[PDB]
Swiss-Prot record, chains A, B:
This is Protein ppBat. SUPFAM superfamilies: Class I glutamine amidotransferase-like. Riboflavin binds at N161, W164. The keyword Magnesium does not apply. GO terms for molecular function: metal ion binding; nucleotide binding. It comes from Bacteroides thetaiotaomicron (strain ATCC 29148 / DSM 2079 / JCM 5827 / CCUG 10774 / NCTC 10582 / VPI-5482 / E50).
Length: 175, 175
């Protein structure tokens, strides 16, 4: 019955968005493990702070059944995602997202998180919140202009500044 | 003429509160440096994340005139402050807050940040916003129950959840 959350942090990752999830989980006693979307668990933030997380994204593949939810913390790695699309960690990212979406896991994200989910196709026929610049990239999903969208098991926010509009409902759904 | 900000992060520090400042500073081209209120450059967050900042608080002394603002990021280190009040890094904390207060630098903080400010007497006759649990610990200052208090050069918030009520003003003050 005990839930488990897999948190995905890109490199670099928006620290404000990330530690809104993590500090909320810790204070509510929600278990979580943070995975780096890179070849090392030592990442940076957009602000420049060096951050050493729990593990890498490669060690998440095959362990999707051990978690009940997935969190995509957006960052400045996304505006250059297309350049590094063929990077090992960026390939593992789409695979992890795809598997979690098929298991029916709780999909959580913000900013460009909806687009990364939509690149797979798990957001088909689902209301999602996404950054105004990543909105025309939403093909399978149904992008809205709302600060946050909760449809089925998809919990998305427009950016890191509108996470507060959905975070309590995310918390009460986990523990 | 370039406004430089000195950010003080405790150990452990509330990650959500800290990166609300740093990411906001980054997106607005505000120069800042993060000093660890601990023995070493490497600290952790309340969530458990290993965080490596810029420098230690000891290397801030004598260089307070090289900054225009002082930020106090509260954390779980404060409820254990009375036990470690005689620690070298906690002694340096009170001495750098004093120095920044003498030159009339922009004093920023949240949660129990106003309490640490009031422990020096810099907040005399000044309205401050502080955590409800730390409110009776305000003798020199004028503690309120408001989310944020801006009085003169003091910019305090009730906790990490009410930083957004004063942060736009902080950014404008730092350009
Ligand atoms: C932790 C956190 C809590 C917030 N809470 C609120 C809130 O209660 N009401 C609100 O209108 N905006 C809230 N915001 C967003 C905030 O109003 C906005 O991002 C800017 O401060 C003003 O545009 C919050 C943002 C963060 C990061
Ligand atoms: Zn983003
Ligand atoms: Zn605190």
């Amino acid at each position: 019955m005990a839930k488990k959350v897999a948190v995905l942090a890109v490199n670099p990752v928006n620290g404000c968005g990330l530690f809104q999830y993590l500090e909320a989980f810790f204070e509510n006693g929600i278990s979580y493990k943070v995975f780096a979307v890179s070849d090392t668990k030592e990442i940076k933030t957009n602000s420049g702070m060096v951050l050493i997380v729990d593990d890498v994204i490669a060690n998440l593949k095959g362990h999707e059944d051990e978690f009940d939810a997935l969190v995509f913390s957006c960052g400045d790695a996304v505006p250059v995602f297309q350049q590094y699309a063929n990077q090992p960690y960026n390939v593992d990212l789409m695979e992890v997202i795809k598997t979690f979406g098929e298991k029916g896991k709780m999909m959580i994200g913000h900013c460009a998180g909806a687009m990364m989910f939509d690149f797979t196709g798990i957001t088909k026929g689902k209301k999602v919140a996404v950054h105004p610049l990543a909105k025309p990239a939403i093909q399978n999903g149904i992008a809205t202009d709302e600060k946050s969208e909760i449809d089925g098991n998809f919990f998305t926010a427009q950016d890191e500044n509108t996470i507060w509009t959905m975070l309590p409902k995310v918390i009460e759904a986990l523990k």
